[PDB]
Amino acid sequence: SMARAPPYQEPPWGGPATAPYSLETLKGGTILGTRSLKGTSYCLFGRLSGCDVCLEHPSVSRYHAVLQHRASGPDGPGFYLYDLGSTHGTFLNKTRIPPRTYCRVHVGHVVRFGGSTRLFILQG
Amino acid sequence: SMARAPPYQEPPWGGPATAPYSLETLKGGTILGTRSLKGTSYCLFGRLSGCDVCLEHPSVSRYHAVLQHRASGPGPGFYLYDLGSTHGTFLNKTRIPPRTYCRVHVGHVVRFGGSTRLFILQG
Secondary structure, eight states, X not given: OOOOOOSOOOOTTBOXXXXXXXXXXXXXXXXXXXXXXXXXXEEEXXXXXXXXXXXXXXXXXXXXXXXXXXXXXXXXXXXXXXXXXXXSOXXXXXXXXXXTXXXXXXXXXXXXXXXXXXXXXXXX | OOOOOOSOOOOTTBOOOOSOOEEEEEETTEEEEEEEOTTOSEEEEESSTTSSEEXXXXXXXXXXXXXXXXXXXXXXXXXXXXXXXXXXXXXXXXXXXXTOOEEOOTTOEEEETTOOEEEEEEO
């Protein structure tokens, strides 16, 4: 069979995060760990082991969503959520975002994928 | 009926938040809602009805803590200040010292006493 394409193409405006932004995980009222976004151009979330963040919940799509960073100017931050046509949705605070549409993630905003219990907080 | 005034003195460096900052409230992995911090210098938390954020949990003090904004000059400056609460104020995974300003970076989590409610500073 013909080898599948990668699930996502980084847009021309994408680039690595240079400032010390991070993603903090919450699970059911409990603060878990923090993942640095420094040096990250984009973070791919999904149930497949090949994702940058591998979610276990069966409602999460194999390739679910991407958090894309906009290239920093020469010098707030430009992070955008992009749902890959997920089966059970991507949520930015309470809103289910439209598929395949870049949605700005302001600092402190919460992201949830499908029915996963994990919440991800963009932090500065 | 009505209570005494809170034991808080707005510091000289305090001033109103002009940018659209807010507090997102969570409980048990569920997002509850958002509280705008627009047009306020400080947000008072506690069990008394006079607080800006009124918590019902009995472990939350009558006047528990303040989130104080630093006056904008010519990262936002928000600082948490526990009013000597009996059962503590938590920032990140730490119970903060009483009556000490502690920087709350955007997206960081605040909790009061034994309450399961979480507050996230958002931009």
